[PDB]
Design a binder for these strands. Structure first.
Lengths: 125, 190, 225, 303, 123, 147, 69
RNA sequence: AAACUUUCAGCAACGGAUCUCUUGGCUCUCGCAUCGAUGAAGAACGCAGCGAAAUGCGAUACGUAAUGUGAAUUG
RNA sequence: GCGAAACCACAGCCUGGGGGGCCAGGCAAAAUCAGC
RNA sequence: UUGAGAAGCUCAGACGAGUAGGCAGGCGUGGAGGUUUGUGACGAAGCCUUGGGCGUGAGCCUGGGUCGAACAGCCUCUAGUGCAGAUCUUGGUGGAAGUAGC
RNA sequence: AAGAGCAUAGCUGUUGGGACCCGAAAGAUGGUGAACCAUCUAGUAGCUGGUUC
RNA sequence: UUUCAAUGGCCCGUCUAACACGGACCAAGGAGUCUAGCAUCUAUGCGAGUGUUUGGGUGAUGAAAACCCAUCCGCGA
RNA sequence: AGCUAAAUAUUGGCGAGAGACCGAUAGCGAACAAGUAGAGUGAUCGAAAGAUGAAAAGAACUUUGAAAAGAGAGUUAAAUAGUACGUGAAAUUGCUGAAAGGGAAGCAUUGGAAAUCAGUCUUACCUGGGUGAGAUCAGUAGUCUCUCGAGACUAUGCA
């Protein structure tokens, strides 16, 4: 259980602060688990999701399709991966929203910011 | 320590009781009759004797006052022989000088556990149909795609499209008998 | 209560609005409270009032179950799951783990979503890690021997709560409740109650030699028609 | 939009523009096609309406009509040979039923026997099993063996075996109709009926469809002009027995189009299991089992 | 003992056939103006304790076995010693798989399951 | 759309429908139950006479104050009238009743009106829903001689 | 519900969230440094004073003191 | 007999109950003390790339600077 | 062509007897319109 | 001879309208604690039914269809807990009628 | 004339509060416009209707 | 179940024989509830006693819960 | 003549944690555009209105039609989810099927005719010999947990 009088357990307060969080909170709520090969070389359980990562999809109907993230859609809480596209009737293709909690990260888009987050948060390069 | 544990569990609340409409039933595993009676409840009655199978072979379970406070070691066990007259003569020699009511139960739950193995063995050896589940999601899908696939074949139209092609190719003798006299000449024109 | 500012019309007020000075709490004399914990602890020493109360203790080695004093310094919860399996109490904890179900109705729109059962109750003496070790096992409640609560010794009103006692708190059961003729030391003017029947078993006097020598000649059972 | 009144006014006005410019796309197209019917052609050769039969999954076992020898080397020497070779074995059917069947299962068991001459009816009595029936029925000059399997006074499934070792097929009847229920029905006669079988592109299509050719007499009387159909369409095996009469119909290009009158029954099957060997539901080897989860795609067909 | 019913037509609240607001479950009339309350002849009858049925052949199906809701596989086990006086009625919300396992075990106990055939098409 | 009629098979039948038609409900019905069960091309010659006052349609059910005519006795009904707005709407539908078999490729000169339906609509007057079924007449093959 | 407080919720500017309320953290000792050492923060005031030698009151206490043994 | 009316059943309409939810209410509790002539609360008008009973903002107008997070926005 | 509303226990034949309904009688055919 | 839920079991007689009123036992609805090693995407609740079953009755159990996420039995606690009616409140829909009428 | 009471809970009753629901002209206070508007007010029954297994 | 036959069957509630008054129908809402005081009966705890909760102490696991209790005091004697 | 903390009050203001509360006619008038729309010259009065789907994949394309739409189609697991969108009750309306109707139906009781439904009846039961299998049998050897023997076993024979 929780033993703090400054955290909330009501579904009302928790389910409002989720669906109406700003687009900076909506970033760390869209995080992905790292692969078992990266979990031991960065010593990080999970990273927040950037654009242009290198992921694989574990759950859902699009199982196992690998790609890179095209447009991290922070509003409707879903990633958008390359070439995983449900068709449309007209002839154009539509993007399929894969949840950011389903994908497994296989290669980070390492930058100066991420490294300065990696090297302090329990790991190294 | 017995009417205490019957005026608590027999009349206020017991987790094994089942409110039937003409009876009440006990969900205990060591009940000899299945009902929540005074002379049947295994919690109030503090010297008890039940018969219950375990993996093919029927057992006899007995308890006493002097082991009541040791719930692990409370029930002892005797394995009952296959010969039905031997088992009755082995219940009595173990349940001697116990009340006649209790030994009556064990012998009746020996007749009732032997009839269960003598039936479920014959029942297992017969060849009987397979009870397979129906599924509402996959019988509403069939009914949906049936009429969408029944009208999407023009069932009557494709019959007649080849039926004349079966005629016009001439799989029947030149002048057949299933055709009238006039329209065959149109096939001759064809 | 509804806000204070015709009950048949729509948009109208509700008939006789509920009011916050409803009697929500209720007084009970301290000697009937002190009687209930006395009675509900005795039920925790009866191996058959625990089964009927819905506990899977059908493998426990003894009742009342008194583990040693070293259990008060258990630090990690994998040193508590260790204990509850050697003494075969873990079948109760599995009864609590296997049996959470979503609350039937609008309790779950109201911050209570998950009903479950009540596992063992661990009564300690000194809090040297025993509370923090056991407090993340389903079902297990931990209380000091002095501040024993009735809502945990008879949850729902049904006596026979499975209590696992600690040796250092089993000793303090004679200074919190005392005896029937001797004052409990941790309570001013407490004496344990006595009984309206001296022998707790009334169908075993009737069959004694004191009664069945004097009684008149018996009739039959259910009579013939 | 979290409102409901705004959401169906903002959409009403949005639709009434999408319902306007579609006419504005087709009005300007309307004037150039009657000046130039050649642009009318291309579009028609371009935008043919797409349908499920045209947007199938690409399955490589669609046997083309070009005769490849490895096909006809197989199926000229199988156990269906006697009903396809020069011998032309007239197949003698045995139609049993499920155990302890009811009245509503027996009036359907006369409608199939209307379809099938050279077919007896023998109600299953007491304790006998299908594997023991097949060996007991092959010794008396029988070829195939149907089993109508009702439940709760409705017939739901049908299995036919092939004797003495042939493939055994477990369909399930659906959308069942009798001969009385159909509007504008007809009387059947003693004439042996004629066959048509359509759209069995898959190789397994030409394994079931031969086991449906195997129940009918290999040369029918034509005086009755009776036709029986086995039309696969989206993996449903439609069964419709008709009686025809050729009459002039100007719409279809030959000018002569017949008119059908149904006889009954009207049932429709799936395909669930296929076993080479007599049908034992637990002691058998599966030639093809129906995956009830890989048929979700309406563009995936196995028949 | 052969089962018997003192009545077979249930009772039907007065004028619950004319009006659609008034339901058919019985409600004793409360007015002394009533024709029914004073029990005028020709009007409908009433539930009384006279129509109570035999205290031994009560709750029995026309076969003779009383009913019993078995909602899981260990609720039919209690009926082991009572297979000639109880019929194991399966509850309605039980899944079409947990149902097919009660039937295969109640059949070993010789217990009549009244609606074993639901959701279970046999092959 | 899920229609109200057991007929209208894919074989020899076609359907159209018209929803939210801003006419009266008690006026298109008596038209609808007159044209029902008739052949298609005859119904066209029938209703155009209503448009030129050459034939009146009887008012059987909703016969409120309908004056007697001389031609209402062709069917035996006392009262009849010449509605023009409602039969204008039916002509629009029956064009789609044709032009749907014209796309399915049926036989047009055996085409009867099988099932005409007239319902109500969500009130804004008394608007209407209409669905129509046109079907071929389900001919009969002569029986083969004897066996 | 209120005109002031309909305003912030219908807006999109976060509330001035100030988490400033947890019990059971009894105020740590300043003023003196020796008593800061021998204080144990969980134990209540009257159990610290009458452990390390001092009184909370020189007068009478108007309640029944705790008895643990 | 057909029609019409009534009754039953099936289907299609009407209609929005029941059931399930719930960024809302209502109630109790806890911490805190902070509007204005240095122009408050309120009003009007404007400002969005495409905005329409809404929001934010003031011609630096759906805001700039400074810090922090760290690569989005979205129709 | 558009198109209400009031009103609405269920209703609708007469004679006599205790009113539309009860008792005993006269009788009794659809579906409608105009005076009344 | 087992019929010890001694709150059970059993034997025998008489009795049976009922107003104001008095007494007793039960049925059902929303939430709360305990319990059913409780039911549920193989379809929970609801809803419909020319299906079956129980109770004297309030009611309950169930087959079929529909449907799509939760729900119930038992022992207690609790109440905003039961509708035919109030020229009842809100909503929906009828006959008068395609009449009155423009 | 060798004390029987105190406390808690439940039932029914009784008074007092809005007091089973609804209906019954009033007056006051403060305003708007040249009578109306809120508020006390949940004004007033001896009484009229209704009051749910 | 639908219907037929035979026989019976004055429309419901409020009123005070008929009436009158209410009723077009369907759905959801909708009426002896909360609190204080007094009295009776019953239950329980203690008993010449009885009553913890104004407060104080305590409560690491909803710490508004539970638990403990000084000095008065109320009712009775 | 004057000042002064703390204990105390707090339907408002800035936050916070809860609840045996209401669950879209309820709970604030206001879950949604709400003191908004709208009404009054004015003070003031003041509503109705939540839910497609997991993902809009919100129906390409062909054709009739001036339009609206309709039909073929097509997406979906579901269109028996098409923005008149979760489930979709009753009144009430139209069609179809079967009935009934001589200036009253309605209901109750006993039965005819039509339709239809259920019942375990499916099979089970019980009795000898012979053949094979072993186990609770061995004029038998071992292990473990409990308490000499009581169960669980592993061998080997199956007398």
């Amino acid at each position: 259980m929780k033993f703090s009088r400054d955290v909330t357990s009501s579904r009302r307060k928790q389910r409002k602060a989720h669906f109406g969080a700003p687009s900076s909170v909506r970033r760390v709520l869209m995080s992905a688990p790292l692969s078992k090969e990266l979990r031991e070389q960065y010593k990080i359980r999970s990273l927040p999701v950037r654009r242009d990562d290198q992921i694989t999809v574990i759950r859902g109907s699009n199982k196992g399709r690998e790609g890179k993230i095209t447009s991290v859609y922070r509003k409707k809480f879903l990633l958008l991966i390359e070439r995983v596209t449900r068709e449309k009737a007209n002839g154009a293709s539509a993007p399929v929203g894969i949840d950011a909690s389903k994908v497994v990260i296989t290669k980070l888009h390492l930058d100066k910011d991420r490294k300065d987050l990696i090297v302090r948060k329990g790991g190294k390069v | 320590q017995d009417e205490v544990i019957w005026q608590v569990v027999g009349h206020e609340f017991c987790s094994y009781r089942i409110k039937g409409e003409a009876q009440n039933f006990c969900r205990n595993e060591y009940n000899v009759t299945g009902l929540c009676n005074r002379q049947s409840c295994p919690l109030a009655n503090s010297r008890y004797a039940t018969v219950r199978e375990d993996n093919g072979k029927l057992y006899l379970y007995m308890k006493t006052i002097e082991r009541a406070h040791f719930p692990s070691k409370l029930w002892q066990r005797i394995k009952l022989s296959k010969n039905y007259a031997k088992a009755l003569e082995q219940i009595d020699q173990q349940l001697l000088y116990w009340p006649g009511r209790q030994i009556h139960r064990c012998k009746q739950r020996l007749t009732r556990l032997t009839q269960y193995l003598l039936k479920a063995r014959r029942l297992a050896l017969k060849h009987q149909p397979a009870l397979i589940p129906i599924k509402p999601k996959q019988a509403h899908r069939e009914a949906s795609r049936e009429r969408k696939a029944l009208i999407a074949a023009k069932l009557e139209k494709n019959i007649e499209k080849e039926l004349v092609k079966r005629l016009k190719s001439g799989v029947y003798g030149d002048q057949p008998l299933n055709v009238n006299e006039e329209i065959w000449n149109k096939v001759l024109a064809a | 209560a509804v806000s204070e500012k015709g009950n048949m019309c729509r948009s109208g007020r509700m008939f006789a609005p509920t009011k916050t000075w409803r009697k929500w709490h209720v007084k009970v004399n301290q000697n009937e409270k002190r009687y209930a914990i006395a009675s509900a602890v005795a039920a925790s020493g009866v191996p058959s009032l625990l089964l009927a109360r819905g506990h899977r203790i059908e493998e426990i080695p003894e009742v009342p179950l008194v583990v040693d004093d070293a259990v008060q310094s258990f630090q990690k919860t994998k040193e508590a799951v260790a204990l509850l399996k050697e003494i075969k109490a873990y079948r109760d904890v599995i009864k609590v783990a296997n049996s959470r179900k979503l609350r039937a109705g609008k309790g779950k729109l109201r911050n209570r979503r998950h009903v479950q059962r009540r596992g063992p109750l661990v009564v300690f003496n000194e809090d040297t890690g025993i509370v923090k070790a056991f407090r993340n096992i389903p079902g297990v409640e931990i209380v000091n021997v002095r501040r024993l609560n009735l809502l945990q010794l008879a949850p729902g009103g049904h006596l026979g709560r499975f209590v696992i006692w600690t040796k250092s708190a089993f000793g303090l059961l004679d200074s919190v409740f005392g005896s029937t003729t001797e004052v409990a030391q941790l309570k001013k003017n407490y004496f344990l109650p006595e009984n309206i029947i001296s022998n707790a078993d009334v169908t075993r006097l009737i069959n004694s030699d004191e009664i069945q020598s004097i009684v008149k000649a018996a009739g039959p059972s259910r009579v013939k028609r | 939009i979290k409102n409901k009144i705004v959401r169906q006014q903002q959409y009403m006005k949005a639709l009434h523009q999408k319902n306007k410019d579609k006419l504005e796309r087709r009005k300007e197209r309307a004037k150039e096609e009657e000046k130039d019917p050649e642009k009318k052609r291309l579009r028609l050769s371009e935008n043919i309406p797409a349908t499920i039969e045209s947007k199938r999954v690409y399955d490589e076992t669609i046997i083309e009509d070009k005769p490849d020898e490895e096909l006809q080397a197989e199926l000229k020497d199988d156990e269906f040979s006697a009903y396809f070779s020069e011998e032309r074995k007239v197949p003698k059917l045995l139609v049993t039923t499920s155990k302890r069947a009811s009245r509503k299962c027996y009036d359907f068991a006369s409608e199939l026997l209307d379809c099938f001459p050279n077919a007896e009816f023998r109600k299953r009595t007491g304790d006998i099993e299908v594997h023991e029936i097949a060996e007991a029925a092959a010794k008396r000059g029988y070829t195939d063996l149907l089993v109508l399997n009702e439940d709760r006074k409705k017939t739901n499934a049908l299995t036919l075996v092939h004797l003495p070792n042939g493939p055994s097929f477990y369909f399930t009847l659906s959308n069942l109709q009798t001969a009385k229920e159909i509007s504008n029905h007809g009387r059947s006669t003693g004439h042996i009926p004629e066959l048509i079988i359509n759209n069995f592109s898959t190789r397994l299509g030409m394994t079931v469809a031969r086991a449906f050719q195997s129940l009918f007499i290999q040369t029918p009387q034509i005086q009755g002009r009776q036709v029986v159909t086995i039309h696969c369409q989206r993996d449903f095996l439609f069964f419709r027995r008709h009686r025809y009469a050729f009459r002039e119909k100007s719409n279809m290009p030959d000018g002569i189009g017949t008119g059908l009158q149904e006889l009954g029954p009207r049932f429709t099957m799936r395909l669930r299991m296929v076993q080479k060997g007599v049908w034992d539901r637990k002691e058998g080897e599966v030639f093809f089992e129906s995956n009830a989860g890989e048929e979700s795609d309406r563009r995936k067909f196995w028949l | 003992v052969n089962i018997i019913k003192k009545r077979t037509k249930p009772f039907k609240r007065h004028q619950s056939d004319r009006f659609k607001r008034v339901g058919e479950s019985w409600r004793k009339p409360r007015g002394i103006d009533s024709c029914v309350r004073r029990r005028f002849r020709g009007t409908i009858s009433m539930p009384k304790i006279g129509y109570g049925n035999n205290k031994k052949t009560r709750y029995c199906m026309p076969n003779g076995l009383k009913a019993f809701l078995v909602r899981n596989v260990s609720d039919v086990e209690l009926l082991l010693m009572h297979n000639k006086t109880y019929a194991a009625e399966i509850a309605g919300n039980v899944s079409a798989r947990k149902r097919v396992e009660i039937v295969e075990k109640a059949r070993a106990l010789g217990v009549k399951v009244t609606n074993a055939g639901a959701k279970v098409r046999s092959q | 759309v899920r229609y109200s009629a057991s007929p209208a098979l894919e074989t020899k039948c076609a359907k159209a429908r018209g929803a939210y038609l801003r006419t009266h409900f008690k006026n298109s019905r008596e038209v609808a139950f007159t044209i029902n069960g008739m052949s298609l091309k005859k119904a066209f010659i029938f209703l155009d006479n209503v448009k030129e006052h050459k034939q009146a349609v009887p008012f059987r059910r909703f016969n409120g104050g309908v004056g007697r005519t001389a031609q209402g006795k062709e069917f035996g009904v006392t009262q009849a009238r010449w509605p023009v707005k409602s039969v204008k709407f039916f002509y629009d539908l029956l064009k789609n009743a044709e032009a749907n078999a014209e796309a399915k490729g049926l036989d047009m000169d055996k085409l009867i009106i099988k099932h005409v339906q007239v319902n109500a609509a969500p009130k804004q007057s008394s608007p209407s829903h209409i669905e129509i079924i046109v079907a071929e007449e389900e001919e009969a093959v002569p029986k083969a001689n004897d066996t | 519900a209120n005109p002031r407080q309909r305003n912030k919720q219908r807006s999109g500017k976060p509330r001035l969230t100030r988490r400033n309320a947890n019990k059971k953290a009894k105020a740590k000792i300043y003023g003196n440094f020796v008593i800061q050492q021998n204080w144990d923060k969980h134990a209540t005031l009257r159990q610290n004073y009458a452990r390390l030698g001092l009184l909370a009151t020189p007068n009478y206490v108007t309640g029944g003191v705790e008895k643990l043994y």
